[PDB]
Design a protein around this ligand. Sequence first.
Ligand code: AZA
Ligand code: AZA
Ligand code: AZA
Ligand code: AZA
Lengths: 287, 287, 287, 287
Amino acid sequence: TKVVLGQNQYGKAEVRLVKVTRNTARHEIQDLNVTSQLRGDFEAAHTAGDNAHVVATDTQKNTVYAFARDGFATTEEFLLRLGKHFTEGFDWVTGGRWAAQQFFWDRINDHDHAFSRNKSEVRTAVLEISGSEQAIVAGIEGLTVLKSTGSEFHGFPRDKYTTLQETTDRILATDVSARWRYNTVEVDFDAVYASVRGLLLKAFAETHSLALQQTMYEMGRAVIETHPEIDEIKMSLPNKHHFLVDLQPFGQDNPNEVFYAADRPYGLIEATIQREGSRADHPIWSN
Amino acid sequence: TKVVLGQNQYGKAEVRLVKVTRNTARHEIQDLNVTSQLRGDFEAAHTAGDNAHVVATDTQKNTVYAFARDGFATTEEFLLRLGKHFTEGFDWVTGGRWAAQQFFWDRINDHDHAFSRNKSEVRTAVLEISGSEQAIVAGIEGLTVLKSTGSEFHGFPRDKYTTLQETTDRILATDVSARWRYNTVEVDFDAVYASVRGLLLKAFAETHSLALQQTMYEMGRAVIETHPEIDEIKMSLPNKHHFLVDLQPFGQDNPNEVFYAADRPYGLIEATIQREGSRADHPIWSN
Amino acid sequence: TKVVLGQNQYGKAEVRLVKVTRNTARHEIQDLNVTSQLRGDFEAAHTAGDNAHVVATDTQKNTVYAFARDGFATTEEFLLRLGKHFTEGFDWVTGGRWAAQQFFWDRINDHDHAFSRNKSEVRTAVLEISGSEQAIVAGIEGLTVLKSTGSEFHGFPRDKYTTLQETTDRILATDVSARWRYNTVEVDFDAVYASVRGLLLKAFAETHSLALQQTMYEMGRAVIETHPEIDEIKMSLPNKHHFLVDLQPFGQDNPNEVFYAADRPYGLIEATIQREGSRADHPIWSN
Amino acid sequence: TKVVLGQNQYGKAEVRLVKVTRNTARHEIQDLNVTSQLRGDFEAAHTAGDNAHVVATDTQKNTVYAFARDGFATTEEFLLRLGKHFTEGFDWVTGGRWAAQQFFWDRINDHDHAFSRNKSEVRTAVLEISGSEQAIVAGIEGLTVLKSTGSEFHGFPRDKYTTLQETTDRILATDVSARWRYNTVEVDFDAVYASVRGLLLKAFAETHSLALQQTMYEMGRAVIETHPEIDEIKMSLPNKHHFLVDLQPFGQDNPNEVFYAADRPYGLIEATIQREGSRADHPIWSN
Ligand SMILES: O=c1[nH]c(=O)c2nn[nH]c2[nH]1
Ligand SMILES: O=c1[nH]c(=O)c2nn[nH]c2[nH]1
Ligand SMILES: O=c1[nH]c(=O)c2nn[nH]c2[nH]1
Ligand SMILES: O=c1[nH]c(=O)c2nn[nH]c2[nH]1
């Protein structure tokens, strides 16, 4: 009977931006995939078609390119600017969500204006403003890692549906998808992203894994213990199975050398490693 | 300082299952992409690498195929069975999240056992168990729609970043991604899905649009009003932009006929339509 | 040593076009992804950087939309026009390749101007011009089909690496990708596309398959036998394996009901079925 | 009336192999996606369903793994071993096409058995045997490059559909996709791959481009002049358009700094650069 408009947001998603810094002959490249969405009072827009409060998504796109013209130090900075502009620029706009993907480029032979893309990982950033409160989550995705040894899995329960054999030597392969929430905007965004990345990789490589979960925990622990500006870090790590091929039918053995890299299905292990006493479920995670 | 383990879950993702029904010569097909993840006490598995609590993801995969053997009336029914099995079968497992994509097949000229894949839409379902509670959210995705007219957009604010021209006749195209949460598990799942799908299309096509937000609202309102077992319905609708090409430079006009369908960027209108006073904060929306 | 500029072609690829026909209240939609490349004397363009001969890819893009304004009866007739224009309007352009994908849309409850996409198959067409010569290849792709029975595979050689067991009852699933070359341009393009599709689907469904090879041969046989204007039909059919899951370790049998649809690897069976005597290697298959 | 079986081939596509070298503590990783297809006399398999000649695609897959056990020095060497084994092992198999994608891994902090995937490019190899002849084409793809200046495009034709503005300074970005054919199987496959990669990158960056066509020519020329074992190199380069946004409506100028990276459409520039006197159109290019 009584229908009501609940949570809502809207804007321009995936605005591809490339900003070249060419004040000197040594060109700089900044590449982002930006998404802007606003939150506020849009009751009439949905219920009556009254667009008085609707700052056009096209306009939000236009603002991204306009602000880019002034350049930005980091991705978070750029997002911070867009957020303040929209929330303060309009009364009915109480907040919103601004995200971006940062694509890495390397110079070709240290060239002044020639680069090639580094597709090994994608950096992300999300900004969420709610009234007077702000929150930034930085992250990394698409970084694939693998250990040829130094990994085992055994001691798990065995029901009538269990056929997996225990092991003390296997391959551990996953894609690093991690996201950490800063407990303050005053952060050296580039330095911390670099550090977090290094910590994750090191923990993955040096930890003798008894389970992907254990490895993930150690990766998460290293970050929290190292950075006071981070309250928590979430990770979604798939266990990309590399099955040891059975060659015995052909009278050949396989000493952990020949594997079949299966696509699907795959284990999916996820968890949140936080600083004891930090907020439990921040809104930024709701998206 | 003190690193703690927060929310966490694990299982086997994307188990592709095809169940054929052939007790009679008239074969039936059920094609699913199943995901199983468990929640409970996995404290030791993460901090000590003690897997006594770790029901193998491989075992979960096996349980899916074993259960499929007995058949299932609906996708939601199949998931409820998997959920009940793991929560009740292990004391440290107090809940989980079981999801699936259902793919549709049509008979080739009414043949008894030959079919063709209907890729126009993908059906979804996600079951979340929290102790005694079992929440189910069904959905639809990949259903692309378009109105060649009967859509306008005007009356929006115009700041210094606004260039968009108002219009009373444009194309409105989007990908229908809708998801709805049932307030009860006693639902005729297949019939409700078919009904919701029809209400969504009808509303999109018959609503004279003043904005994508108004269309979406009318789409959601229709569903909430028709089905009492539905508390809320969320939609994420991209505004797939079809730009009327400027042919004047070629000496021709363009009476809303020739369009350029842009990939990115795109508007992204999202909202939750619901029964007044319902729990628009359910955890299942956290994933 | 000496370097020689060999085969070459250039143009604008993937120009997304949507043509709405709204003369009556009942609108019609034509959706295409068009690619236009030119061939001719571009020696100086590559070797010297002289663009005198380079009809801009941008210009080619504009021509596609300008021509769209006048409407077109079929996708093939649109390409024919595009090709004649470029070869005839420039002395240095001696030919080229014009391709297009055609996406289908269905009305939402027989509505005058509201539709939903039918993604179950994508229609294709390729036109190649070489001086006075002109050839057209029409095709279909992305059409997934599956037989739950009426498929066998036995009698193959058992070499020292063969573990596959003979079977007289299995699932046969594939993606139908078929392309046929017309011996003349005077064809009811739409009627023939409808027919071929119907013949392929029928041949796939009704043929008691002893091998994907046999099935594919019959599919192409029906096409050549039914249409005199077609000289040959090429098919590329993956054998999308659906493995009958072994449930015996769980104390269950599996009467051809529970399957695991694997992603990779997959059998890839391909072949050309042609009219006796027709050409062996038309340049149009060279791309 | 009379239908005949023309060209044909079949086998197992996309066999994911990971070969770990660990006879020492310093592990090595070889990661490939292998496709195996046979050519010969399969007339009966297609026409009558007689599989006596059909070496199962499943067997071909098994062979890939059995062979991997022994190890291989290079992707091309491994392909040659497969090609030779099948053609010689069966009388009715007179040739085939073996293809492979090689994915690269980097040690994590020079660790012995922990790596991270380098996704900035994918290496390719195609071996085609025809009787006593065996041709090998190696390649690179997925390598994205960009010049922020040092590129222009002017002097092109202008007709009624020409609107592109001439420029003396623009962004030149593309996806480097290249394939070169060897004139002999006696090559240091890995050294040449690296050499060619560097030459393409160097020619792209340093050449002051007057058109993508010219840049590509210089890239091909450098490779041919440098390596005697290469008869020709083919390149397929899209012109990834980065449009200089019009910021004047916002009260700003845009001195070649803020760009919009469009997805589609895109220019597609392709050409073959070969050693003078070399073969015109080798069959391997037809696949
Ligand atoms: O690390 C792992 N965690 C799991 O939960 C699991 N299940 N199977 N293999 C596994 N590996
Ligand atoms: O339907 C629309 N809603 C919006 O909010 C919008 N902004 N630009 N175009 C738009 N179209
Ligand atoms: O480099 C280019 N080559 C072309 O042929 C072209 N056409 N438009 N822009 C172009 N740029
Ligand atoms: O129909 C088939 N053809 C083949 O070539 C094959 N190989 N394995 N199974 C097969 N089935």
